[PDB]
Symmetry: T
Subunit: 150 residues, 12 copies
């Protein structure tokens, strides 16, 4: 019931998070570009991995994934702003951290709901994704001179 619901919510949020990463990848300027620009590609690959896995779990459960930009934008809780070259490197990384914290919380909610329903395959998908996102939070926060502060 609600496992399906949280899976679809992730499809929308992951689709918006991918667009944001792409913006950061494109509009980035400042010392650290040469390391953080390609890093955003590893992030988007990882984000797309969850996206594909979660929609197909949803298809497998007899659901209907969001599959249009209108659905993604309307249903996602993340918001987007116009690309701006003037944003600082640190600010871009902080934006990525924010997105990631949101996803880790969305994945937590996914774990709980699927746990309570006994959909253990879905539970695991959410657990694996959360683990990696949290490790990423640690490293970005470290780059930014901060504790992960989960």
């Amino acid at each position: 019931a609600d496992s399906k619901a949280v899976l679809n919510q992730a499809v929308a949020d992951l689709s918006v998070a991918h667009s944001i990463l792409h913006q950061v990848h494109w509009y980035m300027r400042g010392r650290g570009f040469m390391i953080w620009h390609p890093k955003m590609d590893e992030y988007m690959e990882e984000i797309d991995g969850y996206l594909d896995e979660m929609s197909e779990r949803l298809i497998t459960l007899g659901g209907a994934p969001f599959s249009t930009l209108k659905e993604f934008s309307e249903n996602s809780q993340l918001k987007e702003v116009l690309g701006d070259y003037n944003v600082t490197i640190e600010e871009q990384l902080a934006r990525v951290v924010e997105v990631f914290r949101y996803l880790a919380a969305l994945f937590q909610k996914g774990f709980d709901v699927s746990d309570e329903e006994g959909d253990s395959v879905t539970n695991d998908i959410f657990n694996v994704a959360k683990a990696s996102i949290e490790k990423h939070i640690w490293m970005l926060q470290a780059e930014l001179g901060q504790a992960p502060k989960l």
Copy 2:
């Protein structure tokens, strides 16, 4: 630049095309699934390649690529409808053919405009992408018992 304008048109349309390919990938049902489902993955990778290359040619030119779903939806001439499992395999492939035919005509436009403005680097990007997309139209149309009808 009109070259900048078309590169950005391509960013939006390729974003939408990518979304439509995902939908086709997810909602596909019928004989041929097993060959056409992972084939949508190869198309999406290729579309992603154009997306990043066209966007970064645009950045290189001093432009500012569309980088929010809002901008993609508003600027794209591609139309998205809700996902639907009861569409035929042959109708899904016809929809990909439509999208590709539009992309090939957009890339021709981009070729034209860049050729008129002496931007040969951009001219080449459009030409490589059109070539490959036109090859895919031939193959899709052959699967459908049809000539490419370019």
Copy 3:
């Protein structure tokens, strides 16, 4: 952990039979789609072979004694085998695989439950991972057959 051991051994038996059935599909397949589905069966057989080895060896690790003869496989399995027949349609063969896989998924579910109850978390995860991938196949097979997964 008596019941976890017992369900690991059940899987050993059923996987062994599933493997045989998939091999029969592979060999006896005729019809449009052969060229895609014939090697597909090899992929499924490799994946089934991996559950078999992992489950059998978890059973050993736990102090069990896995079924290890064809006669044990055949009599302990709940899956039924019929003589190979070239005339079965592609579509019927795919449905036959779906039926086998639905059985395996339900058995892996019982494995999940039994082991969760006894607190054997390792066996739990083994069944959970196998169940995820079999269910994914069921979606794909059903989609080829023009149907919803109907799990």
Copy 4:
């Protein structure tokens, strides 16, 4: 002297060159459900055919013979018949033509095997044997696609 082993090897060169042309035609002119699988499958078959061609030709050279090596020689010596490319041939009909080409090659390789066996050319004999074995396995597979027994 291996007169007939040499002769069947050159018959093979001619027949394999024409077979290659036919597969290329099937590859290009194919249309219908199953295109996406059978189209690249034709490249695999061509690659295999090309391997036989190069091996059988260079065994012939090795034996002191002179392989056919012009289109005119290929066409005039081959027993395979070519027709104009046509997009309105069905998939099942294209696969059926590949099967008849393959049945021919398999019968030709059986003749290569027997002739080389009788003349004591065991190397040539093994070449024809390996080629026959794979062509016959393809015939099984293609025939299966077409809902048929291999009927070797």
Copy 5:
């Protein structure tokens, strides 16, 4: 080619039983040398599976109908299985594999002869290559056991 088809099919059943025995050995092995012989059993199995797939699909190719159920395998195989037993020594396990391999080599020799007589040169080659490799393994296993190959 009635006889070739027959011995190809006998090979399918015997290979399937050989595979199951190799799996018992893999699983139930205990004693010094486990760490080398346990993965070695995987290699033998992959090779046995290769013969199985190849001989079965030669049979189909000839117009035959491969055995394709466990019941058929057990009933048609000349190999006998017993319950797995951890108390068997490494020596005894390896000796058991040797006797399976000797049986298979002899069956492949019969395969070679019958296909030779019937003029089925492709089947003939399949049995010959398999026989070559099995015989090599017998040498090595025998050498491990301190013995001549004694073919």
Copy 6:
């Protein structure tokens, strides 16, 4: 998550000392089977390092402070070390690896239990995956030693 944090750090100390013990065995090993077990220790060491990095990083991720000095490892670990001795047999070296592994598996179970109770599901999976692998090695080592795994 104070206790999950605590058992993660316990594991950092214990894995560090387990690592050092594996090095001793690798170096001081003598006897029949050296050539197989000497490199096998490298594979165990690599796997141990894997758990170590992952566990310490999970701890850093949770806002903890991993033990990171030989002093900390050696005082906090429950594993005891002794001077290297070439005169130990192969079989006793292997039995010492087994004791280390049984310790780690028990510790990984405590880690699973605790983390389950604080609802730290990520840390929980880490202990479960590591426990599954170590228990499998125990089976294998015991088999070499002619014994049941006896977990």
Copy 7:
């Protein structure tokens, strides 16, 4: 677009004949330098094959009907074939390859001009890439023969 189509088809026929000539060279080559030049013809044939595939398929893609019989290749090609002869010198062989390659290079230049005029830029690019590599081979072959490229 009628002529881009005609030149792509001309190239289908000419590449088919060029391929055949390279094979003759490969087979009948004798003399010092056989050992590098014999497998070099294989590289050239693979390259001629790549153009053949790309140009026939671009033609298909534009609504054309590629030549696809040996009769069609032979009658439309401007390249002439003679019987293989082992007595031809290495250097005469390489000269014959140079003459084939110069013809192809001129054909690709006409390909380029015609496609350029009709606005078929994709076809245009295909000719230009092929012309570029064929001209580099011309340079290299001529350098072997102690000569300037002389394009």
Copy 8:
């Protein structure tokens, strides 16, 4: 710069000098970001080397004679070298690489126009490809420096 041969030869001398300058930067680099930018200079030099080989051998294919001595490179290049200095900062090193790339992109434009007017399409393509990647590097280099590409 009279023609394609002329501008290709100019490219040969300028690329050789750009190669040397990139080497200088790689060696004398000091400051935060060394660990990224030091090996990045390798990638640039490798790419530069690529253009060098391509253009020189386009020039040889066309009947020309590439500069092939340091004297020729120094005297014909429009780039200016200075003595290596460790006290140049990372940001100044990168700005200098940008300056070299800006020069090369402009050379490549000239080569494009000249070859386009002469109808040497192959040479045209060579300049176009090189220019594309060089201009992309200026974007990235400029972004590291907090600036727009400013082509």
Copy 9:
């Protein structure tokens, strides 16, 4: 003798075990701009430290020695001093600390070289020389990042 070669090899065993522990600490406690490049760089260094550790200890074994092989032995014999991990240390302080360890290792390896050279143990001699070469390259690179000369 080869008493002194054996002794320096074992000193390296202890110092490399401690160096390895220090690099792990830097790897984990690292915080600040540059983390993303330097954190995985610590892995590369540890891998190279462990290659040295494995080679020298086993040269020792090969020579008839008994390498140190307990955490107590490493801590008591090493001249390197360890302190508690601390996330407050800046990136540039962490790098400086790695430079100290490396300078110490390179000096030790010189000592290893001189001693093995004076003893005629040319195999052991080469091992120190190879390790010394790579460590000193790392010092140059680390110093460069810190805007300094190698100052060997």
Copy 10:
């Protein structure tokens, strides 16, 4: 019962050992135009010859035999003759001597093929046949380099 197959396998062991030694000499003492292609080509020939040696030797072991396994045994049993290395043998001569060795090996392999066939040893028979195939192909290519037909 398999005495004749065993004897020819062992003959091959001795001959192959000596062939490997002749090829090494060719590799080492070669001088003249074409050195750069033919020098490494002798390594490929030697690896191939080593493959036949190991395979034929362990076929002999598999059949109950005792392979020759000493230089003395290889010299005494081989029918190939060795001469002192000489830098002034020309390239054409070096290649002609390889052809000589290869012609001898192909004829030895034909003998092994025949004997094993007569004894019903079909495994041994196929080993010789595959080796013969490959060596005869080498004779074609070497002769072609030399401007000659293979003259098998």
Copy 11:
């Protein structure tokens, strides 16, 4: 053996005989440990073959004339070969490999000293690298045999 060329040639003869001995060991081996030690002989032979090629070619490079006939090898080598014998135990086979390696290590020390005395530092390095790896093998072989390396 009065110079570097003379000791290089001595190594050619001795490595040739060592190679022959290792093949005998590989072939005539029987007993527990066969499966590990039979392929290990292959690795030792590849290594010995690499010294042989490097030392012989160094000798050529120095103006020398390497032994290159079995007669030369056998008459110049100090190693003695005996007839193959299957009843030699595995430990006896490994003990013989150790004796050969001890001889080789001593030869390489002599090559090291001689080339050092002459200032042929390239030859010196070759003997030093070979010596190091042979000594490491002696350690590992002796360890299998439950012994110190005793160099």
Copy 12:
């Protein structure tokens, strides 16, 4: 000293590299198809010595020559205009002369570094000398000659 010969090697290796490029480009004659790519192999090996010896210089606290002018003023190798009408045999002879020079430079590097006790620099020269001298044998053999080091 070691620093000094390290830098001389930077200069000479740069010029050797440029000479090898010329041989690569201007080559004509039977054997082109073998020798033209061999030049790339040599060029890569030279570039590897350049990088190693230069960074050893940097590592010892010196300042590598890093402009074409310094390369050319300091190298003892002579450069001539490219010429398509040189025989292959003549091409390979010029390469031999360059490598014989480099080999002798590396012996000087070896001798000086051993004297100075800079063992790391010593091995770098020893490794490069070994490979260059092996190339000399092979080139000479192609030329029907003994290596004559």
